[PDB]
Write a protein that binds this ligand. Structure first.
Ligand SMILES: Cc1cc2nc3c(=O)[nH]c(=O)nc-3n(C[C@H](O)[C@H](O)[C@H](O)COP(=O)(O)OP(=O)(O)OC[C@H]3O[C@@H](n4cnc5c(N)ncnc54)[C@H](O)[C@@H]3O)c2cc1C
Ligand SMILES: Cc1cc2nc3c(=O)[nH]c(=O)nc-3n(C[C@H](O)[C@H](O)[C@H](O)COP(=O)(O)OP(=O)(O)OC[C@H]3O[C@@H](n4cnc5c(N)ncnc54)[C@H](O)[C@@H]3O)c2cc1C
Ligand SMILES: *SC[C@H](NC(=O)CC[C@H](N)C(=O)O)C(=O)NCC(=O)O
Ligand SMILES: *SC[C@H](NC(=O)CC[C@H](N)C(=O)O)C(=O)NCC(=O)O
Ligand SMILES: [Cl-]
Ligand SMILES: [Cl-]
Lengths: 318, 318
């Protein structure tokens, strides 16, 4: 059935976005035997160009990943395109080991695991939203705001974060409208929206209006329409942390898997980096936390390597 | 005397390494008015190529910075090559303002400050060390280890971290020697070094031996020599955090300026990113924390923008 190497696998990195790739890069350069398993679904694949990553502003996501994979494979790390559906812990707390199992039946044994599986954007079920996602139905103002500066922007009231999102988007345009969509607004919400001059249009949103492959506006329940060039939503962002939960990784009060500042979880030998633990992590921040995880992980592997060697030398004792 | 802009300056970024540059990149894309002040001394300038930064593995540090500066200036952020010698806080906790003063007398007023000033490596005063720093007298095994794989490596006993450093370097070569240099070793140190087969050579290190522009070895007090291709040290790493201390930023128990996970210090409106707060932050991690700081800083500026607008609308009240 399974995948083996005679020296033994040191780290399995689950997910090869920027988080997993930068973790693997540092670990492979540290002469650790790394296998990456990745299902091929980068969160920002719908957007043609990524922005805000130092020295790679405007780079295509596919190009970042192609370049990164080439770097990582050049150091001898191995890639599998597949889906991990189980990780099981073995051994003592001071010498962790894991079995990683893929859909289809392939399994690997490893000393450590880095989970870098990202998050899923659950979008509102409104006609046009799926089709335009990543083009002109968007979420992230840091990713897209500059590119739609001063344009007529809309925000759909499909999430409790919609009011704050409209106020945030006013930093990029003086023409921002909130489609309330029956969202409950507080007195503070209304005062803030009025003060920042964001109109609130009442009514159930029926569909996004798309003509000649571009968004033209938003249609309301009884056929009224409002022209917009770009519409924003706050999706329900769900981290792909099922493997971490199954391992017994503790969650913080906020509901996300808890980590220290290197990404180490409550389960010994298990690191987590990127959107799976931080919904605010842009691509370069995910890469940054991958590097930090690799730094800490290798350091602690050395501590185990030393402790095991000391143990063995004291057993044989000359 | 000073530097002004009629719209007002939103952020001054002090230091334009990867940390400051990626902070400025995101902030300028958020249409905030940014001025960077940088003294032109990147910590890794002595090393011809940087390693381990996703998609830029092997890039010259000067090329990373040139590319980054071009991106940032393209969005309208402004650069000054100079040295900030004072930052003074003004206004209330809920509407911070700062005066940034440069050596020479130029001053700027700004709403926020990001300190990304790095750290200084204080090296041992041994002949040859200064000359070979960044070439074949090195510190960072993640940065340099791969490039000297399997070579005869030395470690100088000039720091309390030297023993752990030798044990770490054994991950990259089976030929690693510790020059004790009168460093006090514990029984645990000796057991660990023996178990990982790192010889400990006794004697005061006199000089690094350099011939034809390459390190050849280490000479001891009474003219004995040991041939090595590369020598490592653990410098005393001193963060350039004087401006943060003067602002009243709290230090953690570890002695470094305390931050939340976005880099926000205990002083409202003051962020800190990179080596100035984290001695383990490699280049991509510094860039990552710059982005995270920008995200948080802009968010809180919006909160202030909204609160001020609500305040003003309630004053005039129609
Ligand atoms: C439309 C859009 C546009 C964006 N634009 C930008 C931008 O311009 N700039 C920017 O900085 N950020 C942008 N972002 C944010 C960006 O998507 C994230 O910062 C980034 O994807 C997080 O990196 P990551 O490595 O954590 O996860 P990802 O990049 O999502 O990678 C996770 C990987 O894990 C894999 N995976 C998941 N589960 C499994 C499993 N069980 N087994 C194996 N593999 C698995 C997935 O296939 C995926 O390849 C954008 C996001 C969206 C939605
Ligand atoms: C020899 C060597 C080799 C290395 N190789 C690598 C490598 O291959 N890969 C890697 O990832 N990392 C490497 N590193 C680590 C790397 O140096 C750091 O990760 C990185 O420099 C941290 O970025 P930063 O933005 O925090 O600080 P820096 O890059 O040091 O930038 C700080 C900037 O602040 C400026 N500054 C300081 N004080 C002031 C002031 N008062 N006013 C104005 N400006 C100021 C400085 O001039 C400087 O330009 C290496 C380090 C060394 C010493
Ligand atoms: S471009 C940023 C998107 N939204 C926000 O910044 C507002 C929400 C904040 N997270 C908040 O404080 O609630 C976003 O989340 N982008 C991040 C990403 O990973 O795409
Ligand atoms: S390449 C890493 C250098 N040293 C270490 O990793 C060992 C010391 C650790 N910080 C520790 O746990 O004590 C180093 O610090 N590199 C980081 C850098 O910023 O260059
Ligand atoms: Cl928001
Ligand atoms: Cl060390």
């Amino acid at each position: 059935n399974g995948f083996t190497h005679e020296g033994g696998i040191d780290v399995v990195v689950i997910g090869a976005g920027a988080g997993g790739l930068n973790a693997a890069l540092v670990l492979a350069r540290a002469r650790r035997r790394v296998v990456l398993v990745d299902s091929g679904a980068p969160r920002n694949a719908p957007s043609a160009h990524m922005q805000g990553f130092l020295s790679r502003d405007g780079m295509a996501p596919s190009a970042l990943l192609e370049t990164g994979r080439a770097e990582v494979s050049g150091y001898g790390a191995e890639f599998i395109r597949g889906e991990v559906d189980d990780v099981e812990r073995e051994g003592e707390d001071d010498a962790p080991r894991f079995t990683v199992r893929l859909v289809g039946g392939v399994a690997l044994s490893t000393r450590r695991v880095v989970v870098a599986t990202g998050l899923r954007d659950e979008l509102p079920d409104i006609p046009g939203v799926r089709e335009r996602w990543g083009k002109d139905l968007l979420h992230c103002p840091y990713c897209h705001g500059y590119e739609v500066s001063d344009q007529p922007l809309g925000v759909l009231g499909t999430s409790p974060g919609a009011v704050r999102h409209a106020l945030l988007l006013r930093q990029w345009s003086d023409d921002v409208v909130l489609f309330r969509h029956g969202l409950e607004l507080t007195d503070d919400d209304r005062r803030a929206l009025s003060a920042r001059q964001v109109p609130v249009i009442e009514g159930t949103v029926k569909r996004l209006v798309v003509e000649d492959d571009r968004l033209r506006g938003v249609e309301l329940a009884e056929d009224s329409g409002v022209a917009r060039s770009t519409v924003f939503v706050v999706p329900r962002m769900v981290p792909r942390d099922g493997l971490l939960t199954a391992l017994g990784c503790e969650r913080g009060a906020d509901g996300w898997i808890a980590t220290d500042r290197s990404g180490l979880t409550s389960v010994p030998g298990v690191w987590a980096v990127g959107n799976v633990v931080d919904p605010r992590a842009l691509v370069v921040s995910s890469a940054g936390m991958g590097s930090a995880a690799a730094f800490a992980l290798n350091h602690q592997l050395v501590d185990e390597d030393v402790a095991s060697a000391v143990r063995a030398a004291a057993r044989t004792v000359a």
